[PDB]
Amino acid sequence: TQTMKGLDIQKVAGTWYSLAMAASDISLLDAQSAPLRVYVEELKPTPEGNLEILLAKWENGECAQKKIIAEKTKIPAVFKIDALNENKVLVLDTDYKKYLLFCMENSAEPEQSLACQCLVRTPEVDKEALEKFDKALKALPMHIRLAFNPTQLEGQC
Amino acid sequence: QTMKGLDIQKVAGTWYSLAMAASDISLLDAQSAPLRVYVEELKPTPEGNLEILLAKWENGECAQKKIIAEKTKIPAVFKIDALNENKVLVLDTDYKKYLLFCMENSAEPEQSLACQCLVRTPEVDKEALEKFDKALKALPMHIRLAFNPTQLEGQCH
């Protein structure tokens, strides 16, 4: 599968947009109120080497916002979390300035909890990001695959 | 694409929707999507038309619908009037394993395309998914679903 090499998390700060998603289980994304249907809107590296993830979510008929705290681990691209019934966030690839590929999993049931996303800096559908997303995903047993158009990227959440 | 010299007399029998894909996300998301239909049976008519018996999760139950696909000059293109669609285009089939088709609305085809990969047995045929993902490479799909055997059996009869 994929992975990031010598990842500097300080060069990841700024606004992000969720361009595409994919999950191993269909029920993890199918709908707008899905448990994993979260829209990464901002990443914030901490001085201590951790990551704060700001994501928007369709709850109760409105667009709520939530913050997940990703604590660092021994591996530079692996983080540990405790939110959305997930416990590990793996960064798959990033060029810091355009795209970022990452995944979420639960170490108990990784086949029923794996869900990957493709983040982009601008609210455009970057085709190069979709290349590396589909290239990293062709080895994963994804049963639902989403991709957003600019109109959906321009503020679904 | 466009199943040339399609012998509609050899498509009858029980079918299962193994995978789906739509140009818009809202066309296949959630259980009650307008294009979240589960094809069960195909029945060719003596005059060369097609009867499509499919299942749809409506109002908390598994309702059955019958769409009558009238033939056209093109052997693999049929005319319908259901689900806000007016065309059915069979892309490829070997009659005994897989069948690929697509529904659309001739008014706005970019907002109504939805393709499916049907199989004879409720098993995950990998070759069928291979040709499905390859025949969809020219279509602007934004949501792609794929079902497991457990879902393939209990998608009604």
UniProtKB/Swiss-Prot annotation, chain B:
Keyword Transport among UniProt keywords: yes
One cellular component (GO) term of this entry: extracellular region
Any Pfam family the entry gives: Lipocalin
Regions crossing the membrane: none
Tissue-by-tissue expression: Synthesized in mammary gland and secreted in milk.
Molecular-function GO terms, alphabetical: identical protein binding; retinol binding
Cell compartment(s), UniProt: Secreted
Gene3D superfamilies noted in UniProt: 2.40.128.20
Disulfide links within the chain: 62-156, 102-115, 102-117
UniProt keyword list: Disulfide bond, Milk protein, Retinol-binding, Secreted, Signal, Transport
Keyword field contains Cytoplasm: no
Post-translational events: Alternate disulfide bonds occur in equal amounts.
Purpose of the protein: Primary component of whey, it binds retinol and is probably involved in the transport of that molecule.
Subunit structure: Under physiological conditions beta-lactoglobulin exists as an equilibrium mixture of monomeric and dimeric forms. Interaction with LMBR1L is controversial.
UniProt similarity note: Belongs to the calycin superfamily. Lipocalin family.
Protein name per the record: Beta-lactoglobulin
Species in which this protein is naturally found: Capra hircus
The encoding gene: LGB
